[PDB]
Scaffold this active site. Structure first.
Site, mmCIF file in Angstrom:
data_model
loop_
_atom_site.group_PDB
_atom_site.id
_atom_site.type_symbol
_atom_site.label_atom_id
_atom_site.label_comp_id
_atom_site.label_asym_id
_atom_site.label_seq_id
_atom_site.Cartn_x
_atom_site.Cartn_y
_atom_site.Cartn_z
ATOM 1 N N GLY A 201 27.510 68.054 -26.169
ATOM 2 C CA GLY A 201 28.268 67.571 -25.032
ATOM 3 C C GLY A 201 29.749 67.870 -25.128
ATOM 4 O O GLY A 201 30.575 67.133 -24.581
ATOM 5 N N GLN A 202 30.097 68.947 -25.826
ATOM 6 C CA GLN A 202 31.491 69.344 -25.945
ATOM 7 C C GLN A 202 32.031 69.795 -24.593
ATOM 8 O O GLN A 202 31.294 70.296 -23.739
ATOM 9 N N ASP A 203 33.339 69.603 -24.401
ATOM 10 C CA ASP A 203 33.968 70.001 -23.146
ATOM 11 C C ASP A 203 33.860 71.504 -22.928
ATOM 12 O O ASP A 203 33.568 71.959 -21.816
ATOM 13 N N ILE B 64 31.548 73.280 -24.260
ATOM 14 C CA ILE B 64 30.120 73.578 -24.247
ATOM 15 C C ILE B 64 29.400 72.969 -23.056
ATOM 16 O O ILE B 64 28.221 73.285 -22.831
ATOM 17 N N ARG B 65 30.060 72.096 -22.293
ATOM 18 C CA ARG B 65 29.445 71.564 -21.080
ATOM 19 C C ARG B 65 29.122 72.653 -20.070
ATOM 20 O O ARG B 65 28.008 72.646 -19.518
#
Ligand SMILES: Nc1nc2c(ncn2[C@@H]2O[C@H](COP(=O)(O)OP(=O)(O)OP(=O)(O)O)[C@@H](O)[C@H]2O)c(=O)[nH]1
Ligand SMILES: [Mg+2]
Lengths: 180, 18, 415, 137
Positions: free
Chosen positions: A69-71, A73-74
């Site tokens: 849920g990385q920014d 990686i979103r």
């Protein structure tokens, strides 16, 4: 043509199916995947990239592709939307401020015309603290009933315990498979 | 059969309690 | 803090000894036998002896008394628990508890004694786990002992997953000679023989009164178990939180939980006995047994022990149902009944002789004990609700359980 | 279910005979399975009762409810604990999810007259669970 080989394969089990693992960072996605595959609470660093695994249950190879849920990686979840048959979303009820962000991300991912055959799979993660809500308050807040033509199922799983994983797997199998 | 009462199958959980 | 655990014999010979700390000389065992003889002959015999500054606390087994020497203020309860664990391990390894196996299985016995306790502190006591490291017919120790789960060996695979339960009831009634019952307690016994593949985590669920009250269903028949003793596999925290019985069943037969609650219901069997004993002339036994249990249940192998005179001879039994035999070794009339239907009433009229010469000393009045065992009868009314068998691989279990009702400390005080 | 259909008329007659307001022991049938009623089983039983009638609108009574629970347990092996109603005053929802039967006022909750009413939303909405989350865990 002849379909004798297909019938013979189906007599003992041939369908495998697929699955997806999405959710916010520190949402129990890696731990949930480790419990589903291995059966132990494995402590892992935040998912910088992604995790791909498979689950063998009920004669179906449930391949799971964990997504962080990385920014940064979103927006990378669109890469996994190609050749994807399932989709499981893990909610984080312990983050009140992140609940709105998770709902917005789920709406953005569900607003794609290519991802239409992937049924909704809501997982009640972090089911170990008293601050966690019930199986309907989170759904009511997220408005899962407002997803037209979407087959969603809410299941609460405790990361420390693992209860409800079998029920979620059975529900996913019943939704994917329309046979006896 | 068996002396002392025949064995009976057991349930999985309280289905009526959710 | 035992100094040396030794195994003696009936003639005072030490079958086997294994010092753990060495703080007590091995020659002190010689005075143990005379000390025990003096204590027994003077009424001072106790399971914990004392040879000067060294105490000999031990219990008597089937054929020998396991005396464990100690010198410091060691935990006597710990010593007793270690002795019980050792007795259980010996029973599991050797089907008989006698001197025939002590002198024949010394090779494995010594290894088991060395591995079980080190420096007076026991470390491993699981017979099933211990059977994988010490054998009488050596690889690395199994990871179960080092791991947290020391009661469920990993890698167990079975063709089927069948678990057999046994809800054994013990009807103990302490009826005074005046006709009133003083100690009327029923102790539940949930013994399960789990035989499945893997290490399933059982989720036990029954119709407990506390659980029904917590869930809000405190209106139906709920068992009010005063004391519940969970096994080692059962997690104490889960039961303490919300009465959640979650534990990993082992491979084999073991006791999971042991309920124990008082009983306020009528006795299953009511015995009305009379004693028309003439003064050195004759004796009469007007014994009438009334079955207060349900008529749908049958008490298989009913054995109401009636204590007859010790010097009585030439006895005659006038009963109604059931075989009546007098055992000279036990010195009592055995009211043996094969099948006793619920609500049955058996009437007996005993008649035995007595010598004219009076006895030198009194013999007392042994209580009348009933050996009724009615299967498929749950007196407490506790019924199993569910058993959550969960495995990581995923399999369909076929659990089984049976309810057996028997008489425990169901003795009737004589007049 | 032929046995359930046969027992429905006798059960309804017994419930009607009992007004709205001897043997000891707990025998167990040998080999008869005993377990709590399932949500699907509860829904099927509610549908069968609604189709056959005699339960919808019947005055709620402790004796009638106990007789119905005993008959259901005898005919199906279901534990007599899933036929619970939510505490009053007012409409009492079934304690077991999936049950279509509920108690509604007909006029202290104990003296209030209650009647059994069919409710299809009970099998879909966990009214009892929502009202008493502590009782549902
Ligand atoms: N103690 C505890 N922590 C939990 C539980 N559920 C979720 N967590 C938290 O969730 C995190 C799970 O992270 P991972 O297993 O590595 O996978 P993830 O959820 O996708 O996290 P990222 O890799 O950062 O995306 C852990 O670090 C925990 O802090 C739980 O039930 N108990
Ligand atoms: Mg992760």
């Amino acid at each position: 043509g002849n379909i004798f080989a297909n019938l013979f394969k189906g007599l003992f089990g041939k369908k495998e199916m697929r699955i997806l693992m999405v959710g916010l960072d520190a949402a129990g996605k890696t731990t949930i995947l480790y419990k589903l595959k291995l059966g132990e609470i494995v402590t892992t660093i935040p998912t910088i990239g992604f995790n791909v695994e498979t689950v063998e249950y009920k004669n179906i190879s449930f391949t799971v592709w964990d997504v962080g849920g990385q920014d940064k990686i979103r927006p990378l979840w669109r890469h996994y939307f190609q050749n994807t048959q399932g989709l499981i979303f893990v909610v984080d009820s312990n983050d009140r401020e992140r609940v709105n962000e998770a709902r917005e991300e789920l709406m953005r991912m569900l607003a794609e015309d290519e991802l239409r055959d992937a049924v909704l799979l809501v997982f009640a993660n972090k089911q170990d603290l008293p601050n966690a809500m019930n199986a309907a308050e989170i759904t009511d807040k997220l408005g899962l009933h407002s997803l037209r033509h979407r087959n969603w199922y809410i299941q609460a799983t405790c990361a420390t315990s693992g209860d409800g994983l079998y029920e979620g797997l059975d529900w996913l199998s019943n939704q994917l498979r329309n046979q006896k | 059969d068996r002396k002392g009462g025949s064995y009976s199958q057991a349930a999985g959980s309280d289905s009526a309690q959710s | 803090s035992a100094s040396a655990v030794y195994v003696l014999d009936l003639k005072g010979k030490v079958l086997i000894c294994r010092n753990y700390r060495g703080d007590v000389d091995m020659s002190e065992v010689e005075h143990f036998m005379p000390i025990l003889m003096e204590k027994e002959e003077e009424g001072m015999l106790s399971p914990i002896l004392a040879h000067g500054g060294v105490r000999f606390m031990w219990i008597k087994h089937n054929n020998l008394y396991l005396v464990a020497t100690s010198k410091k203020n060691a935990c006597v309860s710990l010593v007793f628990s270690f002795l019980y664990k050792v007795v259980q391990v010996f029973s599991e390894y050797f089907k008989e508890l006698e001197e025939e196996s002590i002198r024949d299985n010394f090779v494995i016995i010594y290894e088991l004694l060395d591995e079980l306790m080190d420096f007076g502190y026991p470390q491993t006591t699981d017979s099933k786990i211990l059977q994988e490291y010490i054998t009488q017919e050596a690889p690395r120790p199994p990871a179960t002992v080092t791991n947290a789960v020391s009661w469920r060996s990993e890698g167990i695979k079975y063709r089927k997953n069948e678990v057999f339960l046994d809800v054994i009831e013990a009807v103990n009634l302490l009826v005074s000679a005046n006709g009133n019952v003083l100690r009327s307690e029923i102790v539940g016994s949930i013994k399960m023989r789990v035989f499945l593949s893997g290490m399933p985590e059982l989720r036990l669920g029954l119709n407990d009164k506390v659980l029904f009250d917590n869930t809000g269903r405190g209106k139906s028949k709920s068992v009010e178990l005063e004391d519940v003793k969970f096994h080692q596999c059962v997690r104490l925290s889960r039961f303490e939180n919300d009465r959640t019985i979650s534990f990993i069943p082992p491979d084999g037969e073991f006791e999971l939980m042991s309920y124990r609650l008082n009983t306020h219901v009528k006795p299953l069997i009511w015995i009305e006995s009379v004693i028309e004993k003439h003064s050195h002339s004759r004796i009469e036994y007007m014994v009438k047994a009334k079955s207060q249990f349900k008529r749908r249940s049958t008490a298989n192998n009913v054995e109401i022990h009636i204590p007859v005179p010790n010097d009585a001879d030439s006895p005659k039994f006038k009963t109604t149902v059931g075989s009546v035999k007098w055992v000279p070794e036990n010195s009592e009339i055995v009211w043996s009944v094969k099948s006793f239907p619920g609500g049955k009433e058996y009437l007996m009229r005993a008649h035995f002789g007595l010598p004219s010469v009076e006895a030198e000393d009194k013999e007392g009045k042994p209580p009348i004990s009933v050996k009724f065992e009615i299967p498929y009868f749950t007196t407490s009314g506790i019924q199993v609700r569910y058993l959550k068998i969960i495995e990581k691989s995923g399999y369909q279990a076929l659990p089984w359980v049976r309810y057996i009702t028997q008489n425990g400390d169901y003795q009737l005080r004589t007049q | 279910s032929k046995s359930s259909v046969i027992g429905w008329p006798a059960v309804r007659e017994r419930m009607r005979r009992a007004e709205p307001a001897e043997e000891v022991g707990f025998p167990v049938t040998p080999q008869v399975p005993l377990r709590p009623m399932t949500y699907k089983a509860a829904v099927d039983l509610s549908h069968f009762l609604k189709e056959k009638g005699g339960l919808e609108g019947l005055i709620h009574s402790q004796r009638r409810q106990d007789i119905l629970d005993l008959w259901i347990y005898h005919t199906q092996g279901y534990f007599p604990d899933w036929q619970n109603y939510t505490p009053g005053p007012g409409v009492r929802y079934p304690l077991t999810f999936g049950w279509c039967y509920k108690l509604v006022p007909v006029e202290d909750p104990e003296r209030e007259v209650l009647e059994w009413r069919f409710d299809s939303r009970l099998a879909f909405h966990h009214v009892a669970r929502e009202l008493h989350p502590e009782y549902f865990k």
